[PDB]
Enzyme design. Structure first.
Site, mmCIF file in Angstrom:
data_model
loop_
_atom_site.group_PDB
_atom_site.id
_atom_site.type_symbol
_atom_site.label_atom_id
_atom_site.label_comp_id
_atom_site.label_asym_id
_atom_site.label_seq_id
_atom_site.Cartn_x
_atom_site.Cartn_y
_atom_site.Cartn_z
ATOM 1 N N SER A 150 -11.357 13.710 -8.342
ATOM 2 C CA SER A 150 -10.742 12.890 -7.298
ATOM 3 C C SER A 150 -9.237 12.896 -7.596
ATOM 4 C CB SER A 150 -11.267 11.438 -7.469
ATOM 5 O OG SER A 150 -10.508 10.526 -6.705
ATOM 6 N N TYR A 163 -14.403 3.776 -11.989
ATOM 7 C CA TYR A 163 -14.294 5.066 -11.293
ATOM 8 C C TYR A 163 -13.145 5.942 -11.846
ATOM 9 C CZ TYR A 163 -13.954 8.293 -7.280
ATOM 10 O OH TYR A 163 -13.835 9.390 -6.456
#
Lengths: 277, 270
Positions: A150, A163
């Site tokens: 990401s 995350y």
């Protein structure tokens, strides 16, 4: 990575989102693909619509919790029994939780680490040693591992804290694996998307467009796949700020000797990167 | 600094004992936590040989969540609420990932990542509750990563993985803790004292100054600056001048917006 035809690929989180785009584009390259996903229901619908697209005989589904080492082995054995040795692995499964770390429980860490970090560890540990054995045996030539991280692997704010932790970890894993696997000519890429498709949910990048960019990057063995040109300027500024954090410290005793040795492993590492490019 | 209690994992030597000594020299009370009992005892002997009413030792396997809780309780029952946490325990293994087993992953994740997760989960919610209650003012968490949090070669692959994770964790926590005025730093050293490694006291001294500034990355070593500048340049060079896909204009407008907010948070931090 020359020619995709006759290669078998395994894609986790393959049932939709970025995953279905990867599967479709790999299919479009002539690969046999196995969709691996946690929900049987999502797999059946992905298979339904890929069959409607005409790819039927080239795709299969396998229900899998990527957090399970046992499960991952069993799923790999099944796919390799049906479609033959896997030489392309996309560790694309992922979950999120929008919370700062100080508000996160041990159960929250376990859940996100299992899917986002362990899933990649388990994928890599299940498949890569097989690939390496087949390459050393002259039974496989070339192959690729794509791990979906990401922009959170570079740009970490307060939330989502766990995350961001798992995405930084996937980046460090992928970069390390990229350098160690060069000698076997197995490529490794870490996919670092921004927004995937106030209307926010509407203007994200289409999975198929991400998929195409990935295939091209895999052909190049490009380490970082920045599918989104969006963050270039921001990242450059973030990098400039980190460099700005170096302080103008005095030489400690042993400095000259240490830098002499350091510039030595620095040369070997810049050598490895130069060969990667 | 004076009158604060600090808790240091891997505190018995290397960087850890550097941090302990320097923290003690600011007037802190300090708990050394380490997995090996006699390591602790050696460190406690060395330090008494210099006040010992302000230092204590606690045996701890940082991978154990119950162990961490009991160690935290013991420390805080004797020295008081901890406001300085140094998660400094670490292990290495010089192997590429494709040659590493699940046992290797479990070991290094246990110490290097779960150690930091456990330290933060045990202590930080306690600090936050105390800040909210007006019982604590200020505080700091220092997590030891490595230059391997930036510069990741083929080996040691698992080690590099754990250090990227600690850096990502530290950066996230730094921004989320700003509103409680609890500082967070990631310590990224090069070589520590094998005859030309940096003195742990010098690393500790630089860490103390950085804590006072709430500096996010503590580059104790000037050594790598040029190398890191080059790595960053190569990363930016990997961006591809791709064509505008559908939604590009809206999406990039939105990203400039969240970038602006993030840039603001960083400017406040500095």
């Amino acid at each position: 990575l020359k020619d995709f035809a006759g290669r078998t690929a395994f894609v986790t989180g393959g049932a939709n989102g970025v995953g279905i785009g990867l599967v479709r584009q790999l299919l479009n390259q002539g690969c046999k693909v196995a969709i691996a996903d946690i929900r049987q229901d999502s797999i059946d619908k992905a298979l339904a619509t890929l069959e409607a697209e005409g790819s039927g005989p080239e795709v299969m589904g396998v229900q899998l919790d990527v957090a399970s080492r046992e499960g991952f082995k069993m799923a790999a054995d099944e796919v390799e029994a049906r479609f033959g040795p896997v030489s392309i692995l996309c560790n694309n499964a992922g979950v999120n939780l929008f919370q700062p770390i100080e508000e996160s429980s041990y159960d929250d860490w376990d859940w996100l680490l299992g899917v986002n970090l362990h899933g990649v560890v388990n994928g890599v540990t299940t498949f890569v040693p097989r690939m390496v054995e087949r390459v050393k045996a002259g039974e496989q030539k070339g192959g690729h591992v794509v791990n979906t991280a990401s922009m959170a692997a570079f740009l970490a704010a307060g939330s989502p804290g766990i995350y961001n932790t798992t995405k930084f970890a996937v980046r460090g894993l992928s970069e390390s694996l990229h350098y160690s696997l060069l000698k076997y000519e197995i490529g490794v890429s870490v996919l670092c998307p921004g927004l995937v498709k106030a209307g926010v949910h509407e203007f994200g990048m289409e999975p198929d467009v991400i998929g195409a960019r990935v295939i091209e990057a895999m052909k190049a063995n490009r380490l970082h796949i920045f599918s989104h040109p969006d963050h270039k300027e921001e990242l450059r500024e973030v990098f400039d700020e980190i460099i700005a954090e170096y302080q103008d410290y005095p030489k400690d005793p042993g400095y000259d000797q240490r830098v002499a040795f350091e510039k030595f492993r620095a040369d070997s590492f810049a050598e490895a990167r130069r060969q990667s490019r």
